[PDB]
Amino acid sequence: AYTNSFTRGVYYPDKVFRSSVLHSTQDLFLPFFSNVTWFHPVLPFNDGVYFASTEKSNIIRGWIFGTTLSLLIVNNATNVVIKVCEFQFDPFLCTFEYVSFKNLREFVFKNIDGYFKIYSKHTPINRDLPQGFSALEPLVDLPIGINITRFQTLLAYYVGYLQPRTFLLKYNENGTITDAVDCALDPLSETKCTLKSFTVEKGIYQTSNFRVQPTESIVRFPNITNLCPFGEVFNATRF
């Protein structure tokens, strides 16, 4: 099963206060209206993961991230426990350790230069991912230096992947992100990002450059069948 991500997976890319301003930034974001896998299993991590879930009884408690499935994140009762160790876990519910449908939870997991960054948002709901907009804020940053290529969800949830796309983020008077434009979604969004505005006035605007791409690769060399006598140069009996 698959769902429509609509306009979700946007997070505050930094810890910088901005207000009443439209800021253009390139980072790993979930593309707007992207194809998200709906799990009503070990999954790829790729360049970062958008994770979301809907709950009735808080069935999802944690995650496993690593390669040869590593670090374990478990929300047991009231205190989240994070450990990075070799583990011998179908899992179900040491240089670093840290301890902290009706409900929608959204998370962003990315690993840059050894830092595992976790962003999240919580909101009440009353099928699949609701249409609307909110931004996720950083809560945890783990200075581990660990390679992650795959991950597993521990017990409905949705899994998408982040891409190096440019977004125009609109900050309100109180510093929150209230609106965003995915600059690669359509020509109108390209215009909005180019003009750095969420409104476009009547007219014609140059926003990009079209280029016809190469298909295949043609390689041509002359009809040479012999080999160069390097042996007679480097393995010679006399110089």
Partner: peptide, 29 residues
């Protein structure tokens, strides 16, 4: 280039590919 009425009227746009022949890219040359 993106050709558009203001977004206060419509989000429909038309796109002009400058100095190209359409077969390379409502299609009007």
């Amino acid at each position: 280039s993106v050709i558009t009425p203001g977004t206060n009227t419509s989000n429909q746009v038309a796109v002009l590919y400058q100095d190209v022949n359409c077969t390379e890219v409502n299609v009007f040359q």
